[PDB]
């Protein structure tokens, strides 16, 4: 993946977004923007240029699953990688993530090493 790939980090908790942003920076990914929920995320995605989405599961107004489906059902955004992050892994949510087209699914908290591993799995799958 290009070091300048533009990420959108979506989470309703500002501190979690900051942490993810810092982990990305530690990996060399400096081009990162934030969104506080699915609606806000879609609004910023309309600006174009994004190449990777990392989204939390539980958020008001539009949660992560809802955001993921919206992205996958949109002609211009349908191919964007989306890594789901969740406070708790439940079989039902994992199966839901797969059905909706999640590129990845990771339980927080996670280290930079784990983030790198999950990103690389996605890059490899998609030929990025």
């Amino acid at each position: 993946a290009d070091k300048e790939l533009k990420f959108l980090v979506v989470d309703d908790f500002s501190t979690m977004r900051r942490i993810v942003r810092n982990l990305l920076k530690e990996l060399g990914f400096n081009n990162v923007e934030e969104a506080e929920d699915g609606v806000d995320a879609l609004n910023k995605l309309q600006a174009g240029g994004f190449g990777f989405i990392i989204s939390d599961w539980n958020m008001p107004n539009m949660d992560g699953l809802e955001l993921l489906k919206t992205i996958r059902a949109d002609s211009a955004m349908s191919a964007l990688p989306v890594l789901m992050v969740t406070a708790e892994a439940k079989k039902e949510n994992i199966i839901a993530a797969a059905q909706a087209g999640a590129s990845g699914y990771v339980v927080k908290p996670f280290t930079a090493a784990t983030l790198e591993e999950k990103l690389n799995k996605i890059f490899e799958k998609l030929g990025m």
């Binding site: 892994a89 999640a102 699914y105 799958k125």
Partner: peptide, 10 residues
């Protein structure tokens, strides 16, 4: 859980 995640490629 982990076997599911692993089987799905997550």
């Amino acid at each position: 859980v982990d076997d599911l995640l692993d089987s799905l490629g997550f």
